[PDB]
Amino acid sequence: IPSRIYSESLLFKRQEASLSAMAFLFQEMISQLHRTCKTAGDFETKLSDYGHNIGIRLLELLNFRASVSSLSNYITKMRRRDLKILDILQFIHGTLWSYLFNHVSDDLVKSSERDNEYMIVDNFPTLTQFIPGENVSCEYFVCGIIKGFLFNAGFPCGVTAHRMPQGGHSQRTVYLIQFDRQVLDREGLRF
Amino acid sequence: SLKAMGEEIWKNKTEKINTELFTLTYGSIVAQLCQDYERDFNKVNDHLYSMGYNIGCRLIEDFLARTALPRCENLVKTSEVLSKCAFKIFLNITPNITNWSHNKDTFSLILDENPLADFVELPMDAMKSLWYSNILCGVLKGSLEMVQLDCDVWFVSDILRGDSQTEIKVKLNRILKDEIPI
Amino acid sequence: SLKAMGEEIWKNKTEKINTELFTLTYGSIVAQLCQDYERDFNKVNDHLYSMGYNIGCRLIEDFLARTALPRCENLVKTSEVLSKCAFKIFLNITPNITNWSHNKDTFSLILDENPLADFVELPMDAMKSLWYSNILCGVLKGSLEMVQLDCDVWFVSDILRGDSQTEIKVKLNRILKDEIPI
Amino acid sequence: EYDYLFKLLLIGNSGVGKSCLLLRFSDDTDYISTIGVDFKIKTVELDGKTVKLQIWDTAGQERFRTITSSYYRGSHGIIIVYDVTQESFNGVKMWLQEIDRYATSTVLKLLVGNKCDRVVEYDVAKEFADANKMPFLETSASTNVEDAFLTMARQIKESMSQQNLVNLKGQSLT
Amino acid sequence: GIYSFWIFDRHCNCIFDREWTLASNSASGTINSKQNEEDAKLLYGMIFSLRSITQKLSKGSVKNDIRSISTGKYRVHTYCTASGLWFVLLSDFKQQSYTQVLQYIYSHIYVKYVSNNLLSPYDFAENENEMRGQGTRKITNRNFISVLESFLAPMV
Amino acid sequence: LPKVSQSVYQMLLNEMVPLAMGIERQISLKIEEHHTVDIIRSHNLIHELYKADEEEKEKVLARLRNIGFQIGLKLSELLLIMKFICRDVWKQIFGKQIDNLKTNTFYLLDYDYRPIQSFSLEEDAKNEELKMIEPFLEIPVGIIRGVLSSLGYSSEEVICLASFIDRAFPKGVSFHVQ
Amino acid sequence: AIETILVINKSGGLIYQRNFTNDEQKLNSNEYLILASTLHGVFAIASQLTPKALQNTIPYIPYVGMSKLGSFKGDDFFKEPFTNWNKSGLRQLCTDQFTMFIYQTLTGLKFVAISSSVNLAIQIADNFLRKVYCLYSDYVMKDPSYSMEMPIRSNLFDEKVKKMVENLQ
Amino acid sequence: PQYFAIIGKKDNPVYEIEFTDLKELNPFILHASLDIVEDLQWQINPTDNCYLGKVDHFYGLAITAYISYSGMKFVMIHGVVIDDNNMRSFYQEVHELYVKTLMNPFYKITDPIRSPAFDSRVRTLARKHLS
Amino acid sequence: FSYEHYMNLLFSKETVPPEIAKRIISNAIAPVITVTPLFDKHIQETYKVDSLYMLLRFFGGCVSDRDQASQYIRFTRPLGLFNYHSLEVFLDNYLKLVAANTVPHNLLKKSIYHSFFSLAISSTNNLSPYETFNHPILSLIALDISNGEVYEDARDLLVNFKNNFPIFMNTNEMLPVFLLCYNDQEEFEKCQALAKKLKKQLVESILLALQLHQPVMSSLEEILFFLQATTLSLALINSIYDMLDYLVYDLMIPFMKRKVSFWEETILASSSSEFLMRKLADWSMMLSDFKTAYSTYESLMDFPKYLASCIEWCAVSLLMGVTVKMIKNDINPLIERALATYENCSRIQETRCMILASELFLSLSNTWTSTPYAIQYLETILDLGPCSQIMVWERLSDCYNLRVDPRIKEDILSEGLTRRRKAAFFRLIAAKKWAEQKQWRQVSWCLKDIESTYSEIKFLHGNGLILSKLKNQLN
Ligand SMILES: *C(=O)CCCCCCCCCCCCCCC
Numbered sequence A: 001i002p003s004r005i006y007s008e009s010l011l012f013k014r015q016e017a018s019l020s021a022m023a024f025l026f027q028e029m030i031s032q033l034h035r036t037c038k039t040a041g042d043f044e045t046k047l048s049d050y051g052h053n054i055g056i057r058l059l060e061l062l063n064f065r066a067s068v069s070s071l072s073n074y075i076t077k078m079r080r081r082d083l084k085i086l087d088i089l090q091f092i093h094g095t096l097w098s099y100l101f102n103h104v105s106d107d108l109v110k111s112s113e114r115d116n117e118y119m120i121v122d123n124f125p126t127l128t129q130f131i132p133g134e135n136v137s138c139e140y141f142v143c144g145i146i147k148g149f150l151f152n153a154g155f156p157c158g159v160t161a162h163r164m165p166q167g168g169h170s171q172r173t174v175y176l177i178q179f180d181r182q183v184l185d186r187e188g189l190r191f
Numbered sequence B, C: 001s002l003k004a005m006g007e008e009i010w011k012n013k014t015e016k017i018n019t020e021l022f023t024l025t026y027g028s029i030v031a032q033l034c035q036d037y038e039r040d041f042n043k044v045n046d047h048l049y050s051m052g053y054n055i056g057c058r059l060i061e062d063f064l065a066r067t068a069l070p071r072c073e074n075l076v077k078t079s080e081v082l083s084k085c086a087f088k089i090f091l092n093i094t095p096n097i098t099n100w101s102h103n104k105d106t107f108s109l110i111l112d113e114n115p116l117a118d119f120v121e122l123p124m125d126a127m128k129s130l131w132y133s134n135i136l137c138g139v140l141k142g143s144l145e146m147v148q149l150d151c152d153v154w155f156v157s158d159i160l161r162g163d164s165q166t167e168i169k170v171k172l173n174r175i176l177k178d179e180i181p182i
Numbered sequence D: 001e002y003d004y005l006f007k008l009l010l011i012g013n014s015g016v017g018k019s020c021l022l023l024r025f026s027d028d029t030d031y032i033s034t035i036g037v038d039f040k041i042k043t044v045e046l047d048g049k050t051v052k053l054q055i056w057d058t059a060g061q062e063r064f065r066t067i068t069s070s071y072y073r074g075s076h077g078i079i080i081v082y083d084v085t086q087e088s089f090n091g092v093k094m095w096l097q098e099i100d101r102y103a104t105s106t107v108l109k110l111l112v113g114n115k116c117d118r119v120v121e122y123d124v125a126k127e128f129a130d131a132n133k134m135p136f137l138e139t140s141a142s143t144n145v146e147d148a149f150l151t152m153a154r155q156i157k158e159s160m161s162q163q164n165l166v167n168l169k170g171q172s173l174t
Numbered sequence E: 001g002i003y004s005f006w007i008f009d010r011h012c013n014c015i016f017d018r019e020w021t022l023a024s025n026s027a028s029g030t031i032n033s034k035q036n037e038e039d040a041k042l043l044y045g046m047i048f049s050l051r052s053i054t055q056k057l058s059k060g061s062v063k064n065d066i067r068s069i070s071t072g073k074y075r076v077h078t079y080c081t082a083s084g085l086w087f088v089l090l091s092d093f094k095q096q097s098y099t100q101v102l103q104y105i106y107s108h109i110y111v112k113y114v115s116n117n118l119l120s121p122y123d124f125a126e127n128e129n130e131m132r133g134q135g136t137r138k139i140t141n142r143n144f145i146s147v148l149e150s151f152l153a154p155m156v
Numbered sequence F: 001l002p003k004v005s006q007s008v009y010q011m012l013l014n015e016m017v018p019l020a021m022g023i024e025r026q027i028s029l030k031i032e033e034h035h036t037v038d039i040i041r042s043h044n045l046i047h048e049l050y051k052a053d054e055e056e057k058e059k060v061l062a063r064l065r066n067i068g069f070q071i072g073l074k075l076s077e078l079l080l081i082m083k084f085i086c087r088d089v090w091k092q093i094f095g096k097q098i099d100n101l102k103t104n105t106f107y108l109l110d111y112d113y114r115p116i117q118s119f120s121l122e123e124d125a126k127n128e129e130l131k132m133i134e135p136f137l138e139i140p141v142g143i144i145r146g147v148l149s150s151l152g153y154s155s156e157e158v159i160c161l162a163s164f165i166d167r168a169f170p171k172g173v174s175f176h177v178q
Numbered sequence G: 001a002i003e004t005i006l007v008i009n010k011s012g013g014l015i016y017q018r019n020f021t022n023d024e025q026k027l028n029s030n031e032y033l034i035l036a037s038t039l040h041g042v043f044a045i046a047s048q049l050t051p052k053a054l055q056n057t058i059p060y061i062p063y064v065g066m067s068k069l070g071s072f073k074g075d076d077f078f079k080e081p082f083t084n085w086n087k088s089g090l091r092q093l094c095t096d097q098f099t100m101f102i103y104q105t106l107t108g109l110k111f112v113a114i115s116s117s118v119n120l121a122i123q124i125a126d127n128f129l130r131k132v133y134c135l136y137s138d139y140v141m142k143d144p145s146y147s148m149e150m151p152i153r154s155n156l157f158d159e160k161v162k163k164m165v166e167n168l169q
Numbered sequence H: 001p002q003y004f005a006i007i008g009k010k011d012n013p014v015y016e017i018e019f020t021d022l023k024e025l026n027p028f029i030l031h032a033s034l035d036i037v038e039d040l041q042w043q044i045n046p047t048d049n050c051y052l053g054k055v056d057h058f059y060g061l062a063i064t065a066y067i068s069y070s071g072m073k074f075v076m077i078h079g080v081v082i083d084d085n086n087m088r089s090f091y092q093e094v095h096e097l098y099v100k101t102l103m104n105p106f107y108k109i110t111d112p113i114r115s116p117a118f119d120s121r122v123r124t125l126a127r128k129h130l131s
Numbered sequence I: 001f002s003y004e005h006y007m008n009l010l011f012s013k014e015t016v017p018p019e020i021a022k023r024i025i026s027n028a029i030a031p032v033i034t035v036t037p038l039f040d041k042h043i044q045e046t047y048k049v050d051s052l053y054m055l056l057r058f059f060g061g062c063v064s065d066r067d068q069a070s071q072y073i074r075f076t077r078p079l080g081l082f083n084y085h086s087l088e089v090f091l092d093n094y095l096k097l098v099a100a101n102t103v104p105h106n107l108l109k110k111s112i113y114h115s116f117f118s119l120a121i122s123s124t125n126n127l128s129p130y131e132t133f134n135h136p137i138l139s140l141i142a143l144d145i146s147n148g149e150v151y152e153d154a155r156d157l158l159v160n161f162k163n164n165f166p167i168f169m170n171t172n173e174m175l176p177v178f179l180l181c182y183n184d185q186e187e188f189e190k191c192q193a194l195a196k197k198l199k200k201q202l203v204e205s206i207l208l209a210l211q212l213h214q215p216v217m218s219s220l221e222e223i224l225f226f227l228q229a230t231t232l233s234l235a236l237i238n239s240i241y242d243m244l245d246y247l248v249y250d251l252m253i254p255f256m257k258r259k260v261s262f263w264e265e266t267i268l269a270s271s272s273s274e275f276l277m278r279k280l281a282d283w284s285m286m287l288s289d290f291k292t293a294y295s296t297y298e299s300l301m302d303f304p305k306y307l308a309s310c311i312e313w314c315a316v317s318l319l320m321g322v323t324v325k326m327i328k329n330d331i332n333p334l335i336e337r338a339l340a341t342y343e344n345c346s347r348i349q350e351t352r353c354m355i356l357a358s359e360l361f362l363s364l365s366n367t368w369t370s371t372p373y374a375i376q377y378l379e380t381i382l383d384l385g386p387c388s389q390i391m392v393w394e395r396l397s398d399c400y401n402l403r404v405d406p407r408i409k410e411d412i413l414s415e416g417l418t419r420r421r422k423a424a425f426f427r428l429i430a431a432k433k434w435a436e437q438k439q440w441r442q443v444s445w446c447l448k449d450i451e452s453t454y455s456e457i458k459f460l461h462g463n464g465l466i467l468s469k470l471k472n473q474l475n
């Protein structure tokens, strides 16, 4: 029976598009959103929903591909499902951004005031760098990529963005992950 | 030639990201758009056309600034410039031209790669009404209007519609005589 | 500066000719002018004033070519260019400026070394109504009009008339408006 | 300062009193009959936006074939003015016929009869205006033309269609 | 070499044209031809417009003036005067500074043979009926044209 | 030494012609607060003198002759009697002492006459060029007669005939004296 | 040593202006607008009037105002000579204390830089103005808030332009 | 191989196939085994922690299970004693095919899988690996 | 609440049962008392009962609770293996009565299962080779001289009481007691005179005077007769309860304790010599003296039948009066040895042990620590009649309902711990088998319970599956 998706492989096709092309597509995504939603909240949550779709795919993509040493022919072990919050956030740091933006995330910072909060920081946001000003609402797309990426793994969240310029980096963005209380309760029960 | 200039410009004078991100983003956009419009795919096609037009009207500036090519003396040269450096920079693909109609007014672009349409199967309601890469049609029309080459652009074949190979008709209507005073 | 520029032009560029010959020339010109005027000196002054106007109108182009000065908006600049360069080139006298009235619409130029009336001594009949160097006043009027500084200039003192010195009041009337095509 | 810049151009026959219409509307304050363009400005507050209407005024047979080509291309609004004198009103037909060659269709177009003090007909202007979907004025030099200008600015701003719309003192894990 | 040469009076009128064509030492062209009048107006406007720009962006020392106006096709030069006589000179990109040439042309051809010529009508304005930018009186002195072309021959 | 510019004196010497024409005109616009006088320009004045009727032209020419008479009659403040007018009088009046001097009749032939160095008309009107530049010669005629006058020679015993057809404007001047 | 940079749209009208010297703003923003529109007018008249006799490529200057260039790889934007695009339009304006340089694009968008140095100067100017055009393509086209011909209101564009002119000036 | 199924986090089957009475009772057996599958989900060492393998038995119908990274549960009523490596390989193959299915941008996470290509290919995989 | 109104919960008052299994076990392993001629005729004249045995059978169980309004007794006819068929027909008739009678089911199923379990325990041979719990221990000889009876009647009755009969039994062991009635007054005086003579010469004596009824724990056979269909005076009920209390606490239990004293002093089919310690253990169990019972059983390690039963009841003694460890080392290994003995006797040639230990585990405090063992044994009995095995399925469902971790009582935390889905699956299995042995109310209750866990899902809920088939079945 004919079909393409199940026949075409999914090993990493090491081929690259222009940053400008994706930047223009992102620009029109934001503009078309702006055309048809009144307030900032609706705009930014819709963009985070686009990111939600992207992330819910991307979790399976990255997790399956990291398994390797018709790709199931090559796999002798699958990567362990990420249970603890530390391991999944380490994966988001060292593999999700290393894949998506070609460089490991700057640093993974666990909060101190509130416990369920966690922080992942970008020095030079590699996708929204052309949006003028510091209207942070633009990069909720990336938040969505985190949200869905966490959400299927079993970690309901309310991920959001803030701009905290520091250290001679005018564009620094901190994405804060706010785990639901039940997630920390499961962390308490097991482990 | 155009080949060497486009190759160098893509190689070490433009930024590189992972194409999976680009195709996934476009898939998210078109999927949500299809859901929004009550599966009415005529409206989806028109909205994607308007989208692509709006990208192309700006992307012409980036293309010219990055490449800085002279004026286009004839439609054949526009086709070679397109297939050999334009898609080579942005999408990193080399389309082709295979239908040179009489007067050389029309030409059919061939998208053997089409990274926009990776991992896509269409719903059975969309199989006969929706063109997936229509943004890449609106872009061509909008960008070629900003160089006064007014062109009607549409799709004929599409692999996602089951065809053998996707293609995009580009028919130049009329060179606008609102060209820049120079 | 205006002083050094004027001295350079006068000393190095322009050549020599006898002052006393020029004084004799103006003696002859005014004498034969007033001859046919049956000693009527108001008409003599009017005609001399017209002569001076026609003189300055053509002399100004040679003046501007000899130097390289631009236009002048304010009357102060007219003062420095007149005292330092114009008179100092054309007949080599550095007249002083005084009596700067309010608004700087009027100023009196003192011409102690006036060669037009150097040794000529007028009869008592002539002293009543003759203005000997009225050609200078007409020249100043014509030249300042030619620059688009419409002006009125006439005598305030002459040593020949028994006055304190030879002084002329230059009085602005309006700065002419630069024209534009219709 | 200004955040939006819109372009209007007022045109008509040579003898029309274009300047008296502009100047009362204009800003605080050459280039006409030299390059074919007299420029006026008015800042206005539109939905809290400081938008400037820049008005271009052109004429001249010697320079017609340079006015038409370049100063029409990106117009956000077009105004036709004719004095009540009839040759100008007849010329308005060829005017409106040659505007659309360079001006895009979606540019607002407005018509004015100027300098009343009635040596031309009135109903003919109204019906010819209604033929081409033309907001028309019958005025003399103000005379509420500024109100129509502000209305046109409002319509262009609408056509733009642009909606306006954690101490983190944590510890690193590396 | 040089492509043309124009003299404009302060009354917004063109009073001399010289349009070298074949680039010979004594190339045959047009002198005071009516055909250039439209072009004359255009050139005037261009110069006038740019002069206005240079008057706007003055530092404060002196109200300054335009030296060169180079398009993609040619290079213009101009040496204005207090009297309001614009001495325009078109040329190619071969030579850039014509200031000495313009100064010489003003100072020992125009001054010598027009200013100091009682027969020659200075200011070339009959009356108000044409003075305000209209009227097409030109300069046609034998000496002026002869010596001007003689001196200007080696650069065309 | 006594020194002044040269363009001023030279063009004033040129302008003594419009003097004579204007005085013979007004014998019968620009303003002053007390003088709304009726004026006439210069070049129109010389065109009128050329176009003027005859008898007025003799009167104007005699006026210029008298002007030059007074110009030259007192030239005795710088220190053959006829040759005084040739050796250095033209070295001050015009700078160029006359190139050709000869005697027995006295002919004085010069080239590049100074004050008319710039007076060429429209290119097609050479005959009007000479016919209109003619009156400027009379200033030297008056000068030579006046210098001869009172200098041990009778004014009436000599009549000075000036013209120019000799070999920018190379039509040099020729004077004949007794 | 540039003292002002400003850009103009196809319609005819200023869209961005910025000085770099100390308080040269003796002109209103309205006055700068009129100046730019008059530049457009004299562009329209300076190509219409060409010599009856007549009825090119910019050499790549190495590091004009240089040393991630937005979306451009490499330590400099480009490394080969390119071509002029306004063939018979106004290109320079010398003046007794400054020198204006003007650049044009196929899309009818115009750049102006007013240097105070007072042909190699034109070549260096077009190189620099191509750098600024690259910045325009980066931080003004990849902005969804920007309306296509209304004035620029980008801060990254301002920072990059000022960085370049301080590299030069 | 008595029954195979793929169930989502909402606990609805995105896809079930009945290989060729118990034919009526199979889904309830499956939905009952879901609880022990979830119990072994969160336990380190329940060494990949996705191939759970044997989870429950009901009259000797040894249910076996496997969990995807997105929480989709691949679980089948076998029958008997099952082989580790072959069942794991089949689970890997069907997981890869499901991942390819998930890429379809028109696909919802809750939409039942209805492409006949997927059905035919998992059938062929089973006959390669199980029969 | 009222223990009577849980064993007969179907005679509105739904609450939790406290520790009911232990009370049931004691109530079925209580001492047995007989009840005996012109006297049953007197009752039939007065109260519509065939014989006195039924009338006193309506006073079974705990005396101190005053059951009709801590030590139990049960009554049996005069003096003179797993018959699961009787149990099955009991279940069928009981369920038919329930259908005719009943309306929340949430405790009816619990009560019906507990009654099932109770009868399952008492369903061995009525006079076992070992299990002395069914042996009568106090023979209540009854008379009423007020009708006209006389001393010689009691003489002959006791004479006939003194001893085909079994070998284990020993008539001297059983303590006789003379219930003398009267209908009020001088009859009471001559009753005291006869009591005096009997006590001096023969035994003891009990003086007895002479609204509905809901009995329990008679035996397997009387309930069947009960299911094929009275009132009495409250003062009479109180008088009966008081005289039973005097008998049980001042005539029987003291005799029990004297007997236990003699046994334990003398301890430091078969009928004597080794019958001593086993009956001592049996009566130690009978009186809740558990630890001595366990010690006596442990000393007893000397057969196909006796040894298995001894080990079984040793384990039951441990259960009846509790951490993981002793279960790992004492209870379950003891049960395993009991099994091994039972399959050995099968090889020579059980269910009661399994259905007892299941509830005994299920009654413990730490539900999470040991419910699994009860599930294991219940599953071990699933390997008996159908209609009972349905109740066993229901019981496994109830057991899996209580395998939630105590440390919890969206919802991501709770998913991996609760086993509610298995409970729903077993409830549906029970519903199916109820549909087989066609019982519409039972399947109705089962589906009513199922609806909570199975309403949210839709694929299961669709037609073509047993949910739809069974929902349409009840129509
Ligand atoms: C001659 O005048 C040259 C002009 C040619 C313009 C070419 C425009 C290139 C468009 C390429 C497609 C871009 C697709 C990516 C955007 C989403």
Ligand SMILES: *C(=O)CCCCCCCCCCCCCCC
Residues within 6 Å of the ligand: C055, C056, C060, C063, C069, C070, C071, C072, C073, C077, C078, C081, C082, C086, C087, C090, C091, C135, C136, C139, C140, C143, C144, C147, E082, F008
């Ligand atoms: C502002 O720039 C003014 C222009 C320069 C001054 C013009 C005045 C020149 C007139 C001089 C006349 C001198 C008298 C000569 C003897 C007759």
